[PDB]
Amino acid sequence: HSCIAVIDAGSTGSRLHIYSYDTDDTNTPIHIEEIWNKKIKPGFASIQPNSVTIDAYLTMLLADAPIHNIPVYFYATAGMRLLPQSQQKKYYDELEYWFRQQSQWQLVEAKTITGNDEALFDWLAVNYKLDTLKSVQNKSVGVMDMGGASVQIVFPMPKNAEISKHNQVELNIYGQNINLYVHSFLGLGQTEMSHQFLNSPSCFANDYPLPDGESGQGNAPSCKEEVTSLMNSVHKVNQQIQPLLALNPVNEWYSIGGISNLASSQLFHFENSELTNQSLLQQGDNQICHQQWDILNGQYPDDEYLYQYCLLSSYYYALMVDGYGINPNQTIHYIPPEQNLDWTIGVVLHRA
Numbered sequence: 165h166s167c168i169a170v171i172d173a174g175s176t177g178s179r180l181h182i183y184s185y186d187t188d189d190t191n192t193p194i195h196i197e198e199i200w201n202k203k204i205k206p207g208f209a210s211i212q213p214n215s216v217t218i219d220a221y222l223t224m225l226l227a228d229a230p231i232h233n234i235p236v237y238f239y240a241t242a243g244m245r246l247l248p249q250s251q252q253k254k255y256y257d258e259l260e261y262w263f264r265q266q267s268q269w270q271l272v273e274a275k276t277i278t279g280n281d282e283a284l285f286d287w288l289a290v291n292y293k294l295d296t297l298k299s300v301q302n303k304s305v306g307v308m309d310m311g312g313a314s315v316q317i318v319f320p321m322p323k324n325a326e327i328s329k330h331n332q333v334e335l336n337i338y339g340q341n342i343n344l345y346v347h348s349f350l351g352l353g354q355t356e357m358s359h360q361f362l363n364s365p366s367c368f369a370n371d372y373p374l375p376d377g378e379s380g381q382g383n384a385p386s387c388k389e390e391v392t393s394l395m396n397s398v399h400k401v402n403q404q405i406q407p408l409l410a411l412n413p414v415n416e417w418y419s420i421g422g423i424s425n426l427a428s429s430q431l432f433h434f435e436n437s438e439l440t441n442q443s444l445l446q447q448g449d450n451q452i453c454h455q456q457w458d459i460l461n462g463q464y465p466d467d468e469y470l471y472q473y474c475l476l477s478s479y480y481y482a483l484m485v486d487g488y489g490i491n492p493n494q495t496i497h498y499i500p501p502e503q504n505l506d507w508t509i510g511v512v513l514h515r516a
């Protein structure tokens with residue numbers, strides 16, 4: 165067995181993953197098993213970028229690991245992407261120095277991966293879990309990550325000279341050439357985007373107390389329309405994605421991230437670990453947007469995201485339907501939250 169470590173340096177914290185694997189006769193990892201993990205808070209991009217702080221942080225993350233002499237990839241995501249490159253450099257200068265002072269961890273790369281890179285890993289992670297990678301599919305699989313700070317979309321598409329090279333990836337896995345379109349929208353993740361909508365009455369249950377002192381008066385179509393403006397006028401989601409998706413239809417959609425949590429909640433009713441956007445918007449509109457808040461809160465006092473469900477159902481619909489151009493009646497699978505799907509397994513597949 166070979167071993168590799170991957171650190172996901174995300175927004176709320178950093179998670180170290182240690183994987184064992186074998187390699188098959190296509191030079192591709194198989195039997196990938198996570199043998200150890202560790203999560204620390206807060207996010208790397210939120211700590212003071214000096215030697216003492218970074219030493220304390222990396223020591224806390226790595227110290228108890230049951231290994232000696234393992235390759236490690238340190239990959240930061242949207243949290244670091246939101247920082248100026250001059251500020252990011254401070255972190256990486258300290259990190260590079262820290263790894264050089266020790267011998268147990270063999271640093272391969274430490275960097276902020278692009279949203280496009282993250283999309284690739286998302287697609288690999290989901291397809292590995294579904295066991296759709298080892299043999300030729302003739303069945304187009306697309307993946308959407310509803311992340312906290314960025315959202316990713318990724319689907320098969322033949323190499324196209326007219327499209328940015330950064331939105332296209334080429335790789336060979338289990339002996340097969342794959343060509344994927346990848347795209348990420350930074351800031352459109354549900355935590356970041358929500359900061360624009362907190363005083364929008366259409367996005368909250370009736371009588372929900374908004375920060376500015378006004379009251380929720382929810383209406384999913386109205387909240388969706390608001391969100392759609394941000395998506396298409398600022399992020400240009402529809403303009404970029406919809407034509408390409410039209411020309412390269414996906415046969416099956418899988419989603420990961422927040423949507424899987426919302427869909428698995430006690431409030432929403434979905435079966436078969438799947439949903440349609442039509443049903444999502446209807447349920448959000450009826451059960452939250454037009455629902456009296458105080459009564460609702462009394463009934464679901466333990467769901468900390470409950471108050472956001474009018475906004476989030478509206479937002480997911482805006483993204484998939486008005487943004488990506490997915491039919492409202494199209495089935496969207498979601499990976500159950502309890503399966504702990506993690507994009508870092510894609511790093512093993514692509515880089516180990």
Ligand SMILES: Nc1ncnc2c1ncn2[C@@H]1O[C@H](COP(=O)(O)OP(=O)(O)NP(=O)(O)O)[C@@H](O)[C@H]1O
Nearest residue numbers: 174175176177310311312355421422423425426469
């Ligand atoms: N019940 C829920 N409904 C909707 N979203 C949720 C729910 N619970 C958690 N989420 C969010 O879904 C997004 C993506 O999930 P996840 O990537 O697993 O978050 P995390 O790893 O816990 N946080 P982060 O460091 O930002 O990646 C995050 O913004 C979570 O806050």
